[PDB]
Amino acid sequence: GLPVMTTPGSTQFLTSDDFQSPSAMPQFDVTPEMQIPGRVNNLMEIAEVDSVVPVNNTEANVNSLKAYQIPVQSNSDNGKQVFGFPLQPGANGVLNRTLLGEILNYYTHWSGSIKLTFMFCGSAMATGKFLLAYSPPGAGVPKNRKDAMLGTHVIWDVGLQSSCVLCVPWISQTHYRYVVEDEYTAAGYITCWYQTNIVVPADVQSSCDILCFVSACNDFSVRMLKDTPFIRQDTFYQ
Amino acid sequence: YHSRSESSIENFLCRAACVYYATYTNNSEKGYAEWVINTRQVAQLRRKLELFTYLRFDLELTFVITSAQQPSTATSVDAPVQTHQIMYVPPGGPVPTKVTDYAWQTSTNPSVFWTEGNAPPRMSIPFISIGNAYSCFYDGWTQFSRNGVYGINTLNNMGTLYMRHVNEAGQGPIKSTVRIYFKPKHVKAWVPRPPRLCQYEKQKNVNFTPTGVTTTRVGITTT
């Protein structure tokens, strides 16, 4: 026969190889294809769908819908903090289990802007202004509205808009950040502050709630497929 | 300037995953193994598939077969290389009941013979569903009266794999384990679904025990 020489890697079974193999059912006639709605071609399409963020992830709220409710009320002071969490979409509990966070945990590196949407769910009679800020790392988390407003921020008026869409820009020294927590690739902090106050008429509940949504923007990408740490097993399922 | 190639459905699913493994020993007439084919006995591939409601793909099958010497009392055990047979029995076909069964003639059933020490056996399988797509979830019953079996198990009629030692037993028993690996190729997916949050409990249904939506932190401002 033709002279050949076998190289290293012969007879190996690499789980990510791409080779042809003989068919066990020659000339099998497959069922005709049928148009089904909702075809998906890339996991980024799933990652780009807004999902409700459990910002209130206290131990007493994770087993109910209170985890998604951000309290807000009329205060007697100024510049109080509403919430604050690190921008760790793949490692922080706040964003870990959303659609974006679940897609991220199948990968090792990520890059791109993050779309944050806040919808005010109080009465139509309520008014108020909020300061939503993103602080790049290097310093700590901002501790007051003065520190928060020195970075990227927007002013949200619930009286004018029931939904504010804040797109957190990608500001990093590297092209990609690790999905797991790593200080070398810290992404910063997201905080919200009272710009003026919640103001309501008589016979209106002063305590209201805000819902936060998260999704990837158009420039988002992931790399280095891996097994997720969210599913595990001890024996085969019978 | 950043490509999304590695987040394609193909790249996401076109990786070989163990779906089951079975064992059989050469010391009895019942020394064969069987497995009803399904993708719901392993957590990882099941979760990856259940990100979608309907799927359509070809399948690459790879088997990793290893053997271990069992205790024996004969002096000087010297066994030749072992040959294995794996036979696929579509539903309705006769099934083996012993190692020396006539059904192993595999005149029409597809079968593969493989000897230890070589590369793992591998074959390709087309899309063999009676429907237009595989179903990961089925909110319905098998009986028109809405009694009896409920769920995805109604649609599982994919057949059974049978495995045995071809060689006749020698002076010492040999126990073999066959690991089955599935690799979907040419994948088409529809109706994305929320990723499974609660841990799996059973193979044939979606039963779960309630679990919190996320892990917790001390307060709403904790960083």
Partner: peptide, 17 residues
């Protein structure tokens, strides 16, 4: 080689990449 199908069945082909 670069790309040649060795089998008569489409299921035998490598992945779509």
């Amino acid at each position: 080689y670069t790309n040649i199908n060795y089998y008569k069945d489409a299921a035998s082909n490598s992945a779509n990449r």
